[PDB]
Amino acid sequence: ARTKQTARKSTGG
Amino acid sequence: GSHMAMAYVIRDEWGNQIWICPGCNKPDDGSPMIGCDDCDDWYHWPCVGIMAAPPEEMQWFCPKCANKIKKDKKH
Ligand SMILES: [Zn+2]
Ligand SMILES: [Zn+2]
């Protein structure tokens, strides 16, 4: 379960 | 060439892969997405029923893949 957010700004992560 | 990406993936103007969630047909907004452990497709969390990130150690299969698996009663 590969979870990732394509974010250049994320809160917490 | 027609070979681009006949799947739920597009490229942006810079050339990054933007995954499209086959769940809603919406692209990634920079959102937490989950990849299946079989098809490696990328769905959004609220689109498959994920709310918190599971580890890569734990496997997960989407409604596509987990269905063929079935998860039969026999174990
Ligand atoms: Zn979605
Ligand atoms: Zn799958």
Side-chain angles (χ1 to χ4, degrees), chain B residues 21 23-24 26 44 47:
Chain B
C21 182
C24 48
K26 292 175 172 297
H44 295 120
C47 307

Side-chain angles (χ1 to χ4, degrees), chain B residues 39-70:
Chain B
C39 62
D40 291 277
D41 208 334
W42 289 92
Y43 283 88
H44 295 120
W45 289 2
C47 307
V48 290
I50 296 292
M51 62 180 181
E56 296 191 74
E57 301 178 90
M58 181 180 181
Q59 297 190 269
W60 180 90
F61 304 99
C62 57
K64 302 160 60 186
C65 296
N67 186 34
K68 62 186 179 184
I69 298 185
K70 179 181 181 178

Side-chain angles (χ1 to χ4, degrees), chain B residues 14-52:
Chain B
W14 303 135
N16 303 272
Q17 283 173 327
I18 302 302
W19 288 265
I20 314 298
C21 182
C24 48
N25 195 270
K26 292 175 172 297
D28 171 47
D29 292 297
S31 44
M33 308 185 74
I34 189 169
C36 173
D37 278 276
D38 185 81
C39 62
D40 291 277
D41 208 334
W42 289 92
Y43 283 88
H44 295 120
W45 289 2
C47 307
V48 290
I50 296 292
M51 62 180 181

